[PDB]
A paper describes a structure:
After exploring a plethora of strategies, a crystallographic model of apo-Tf has been constructed from X-ray diffraction data from one of the best crystals grown under the conventional vapor-diffusion technique. A crystallographic model of glycosylated apo-Tf was obtained at 3.0 Å resolution, which did not resolve further despite many efforts to improve crystal quality. The data for our apo-Tf model are good enough for visualizing the general protein structure, allowing the location of two NAG moieties bound to residue Asn413. Some extra density could be observed after the second NAG element, which points to a potential elongation of the glycosyl chain that could be the key factor hampering crystal quality improvement. As has been reviewed, glycosylation does not necessarily prevent crystallization—it may even help—but the resolution limit and diffraction quality may suffer. We can conclude that the glycosylation is perhaps the main reason that all the efforts to improve crystal quality were not successful, along with the high flexibility of the structure, as shown in the SAXS experiments in the solution. However, the resolution is still limited in its ability to provide insight into the functional details. In the solution, apo-Tf remained mostly globular in all the pH conditions tested; however, the co-existence of closed, partially open, and open conformations was observed for holo-Tf, which showed a more elongated and flexible shape overall. We did not observe any conformational changes for the apo form. Indeed, 90% of the available conformations are populated by the “closed” conformation, corresponding to the initial model.
Human serum transferrin (Tf), also known as serotransferrin, is a ~80 kDa glycoprotein that transits blood plasma, whose function is to maintain iron homeostasis by transporting iron from its absorption site to every cell through the blood vessels. Its structure consists of two homologous lobes, an N-terminal lobe and a C-terminal lobe, each subdivided into two domains, in between which a metal-binding site is found, thus allowing Tf to bind two ferric ions per molecule. The transferrin completes a cycle in which it transits the bloodstream as holo-Tf (iron-loaded form) and binds to the transferrin receptor (TfR) expressed on endothelial cells. The Tf–TfR complex formed is internalized in endosomes, where the pH is more acidic (5.5) than in the bloodstream (7.4); it is suggested that this pH decrease promotes a conformational change that induces iron release from the metal-binding site of transferrin.
Author numbering: 4 to 679
The structure:
Amino acid sequence: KTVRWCAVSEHEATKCQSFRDHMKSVIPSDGPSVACVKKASYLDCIRAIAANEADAVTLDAGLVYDAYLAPNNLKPVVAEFYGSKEDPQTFYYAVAVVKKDSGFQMNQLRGKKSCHTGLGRSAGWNIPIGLLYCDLPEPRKPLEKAVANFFSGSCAPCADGTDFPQLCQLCPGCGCSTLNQYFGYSGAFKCLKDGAGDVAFVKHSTIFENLANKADRDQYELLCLDNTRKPVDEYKDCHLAQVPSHTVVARSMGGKEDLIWELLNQAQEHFGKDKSKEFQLFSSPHGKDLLFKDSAHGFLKVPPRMDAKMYLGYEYVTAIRNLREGTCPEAPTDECKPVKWCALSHHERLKCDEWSVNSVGKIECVSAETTEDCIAKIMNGEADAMSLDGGFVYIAGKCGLVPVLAENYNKSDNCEDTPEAGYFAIAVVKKSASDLTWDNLKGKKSCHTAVGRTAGWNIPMGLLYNKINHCRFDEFFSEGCAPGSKKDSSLCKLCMGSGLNLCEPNNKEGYYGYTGAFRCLVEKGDVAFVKHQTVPQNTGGKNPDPWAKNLNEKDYELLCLDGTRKPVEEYANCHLARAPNHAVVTRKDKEACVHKILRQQQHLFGSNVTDCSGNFCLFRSETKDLLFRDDTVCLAKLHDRNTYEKYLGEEYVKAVGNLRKCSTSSLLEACTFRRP
Ligand SMILES: *[C@@H]1O[C@H](CO)[C@@H](O[C@@H]2O[C@H](CO)[C@@H](O)[C@H](O)[C@H]2NC(C)=O)[C@H](O)[C@H]1NC(C)=O
Ligand SMILES: [Mg+2]
């Protein structure tokens, strides 16, 4: 139970050894211990960790990436944080500050005038130039000269003035000290404030540190990667890169990550920010920033399904990858790159393969084990598009992806130009039970289409989470019928399935499905969770079955969240959530291409086509609902709804989130770690 920490200096090793001793005192024989391995450099520490001679070292984003690469393959496991638990600030943001209404975007920086914090600085140079690399003119080695030919004039502190003078044009001599008024963060910002430069590459924090009044900040904007702008307040939605300020790494396989976290968590409990004055984890007696930055206020456990690329973010890896590999294609700037679609089953891959050949190369295919792994592929560029249900549209939204096309299921003349927004989830009750409203629901008897289902379970129980705030969903209702629950649960007591079918989510349960839950309402329930048309189609002699011949709509009302009851036809105003259609999800920087390609694609192999055997067709599956749901007639454009929050109702998001507090998704907890 020992963590072998790696030092990169004699002073660091000394701090590690006193950390070992102090951890010795307070900790029982069982549990964390510290070993102090000492190597010559961060690179050497990485190669030692990979070679199982050390276990943990804490690194700057660049070395995080270095450690990620073959043959080391280390991963982030714990993260220093630089404020409070309520506002960690484990990351910072590299941004491009500009004058308000200066009239240009990220893809128009050529010819403009630049202000950098310093050459080799991450936010001031590495990140922006990395992203801009391919826009630099062809003799891209040496980099300083290509940057010089890119901008008309620059201040690039610490650059080689004598050889590349345009980089000192705004700060002649390129002083690498505060002597140069345009050096550093405050200097790169004053370079812009003084109108010397058109753009300043700095950190999110910098505008706030140099301008106290909101008034003056309001004449500054930020360049976003999508070639829009935003106010400086909104850097979390308009940054060049998000960068983890200081990250502990361990081996991927066999890394002891849990030991590292146990150890550091206890260490911060005993010797952290101020809670002891004998020894301070975040204070170097012999140097500065030994083992850990002295800014740090504490540690946070990194979610277990984070890999380096996911942690750093696609922008950052683009930046370093460009600056190290230095490979730009010659592909024509305007044309779209073939969209690689993500398959999660053997038959999904076979369908996508046929599609690819018939797409004459416009579509390609990428297999991945699971849905979440596919989403990961979209985020990090290994894949471009896939179709998701509501819940995964939400997880992908929290991961920065966007919906772009909705699967439309209702045939119509011009369905490409009208998305559908889905059916309505409702909570039905019988008028004969007058005192029932959304609030007293607790302790009453209930009927669900089936556990897992969207209208029968997810939306209702998600909205009710707030009236319970724990994950024992069978304790809200006295008794119920929720097919799929465990048989000895109270949510199985009212199910009427015979033999082995008693509580099984299948037709033989008979209180299963929309019809079945409504039957459970009329026969033995107080409330039943279904969609808007279930009552109209099981009443008035529309259902011939014995129980359902003579029931009439008037007898039932449906429960509204405001605490009032409403009639069935008024579902549009009385509903719990809007149960959404499947939607094609992609990364923002590919939204356009996807839009275009898919549309072309659904003209050919789309529902219009007969002789589906003589030619390929995109919405017919050999098995069931491969790639797209087989109901799809078209893919409808999501103008004005191209964000997970907009595409999914406010109510639906409330419900799915609340649920996800009980059913964790490792991907979702990673993504929320990077963006709360
Ligand atoms: C439902 O079916 C048709 C599409 O073929 C459309 O129904 C329309 O409903 C509105 C409101 O009741 C009427 O005013 C229109 O006259 C109907 N049109 C037709 C053709 O029936 C509607 O577009 C479809 N709904 C969805 C979501 O696609
Ligand atoms: Mg001591």
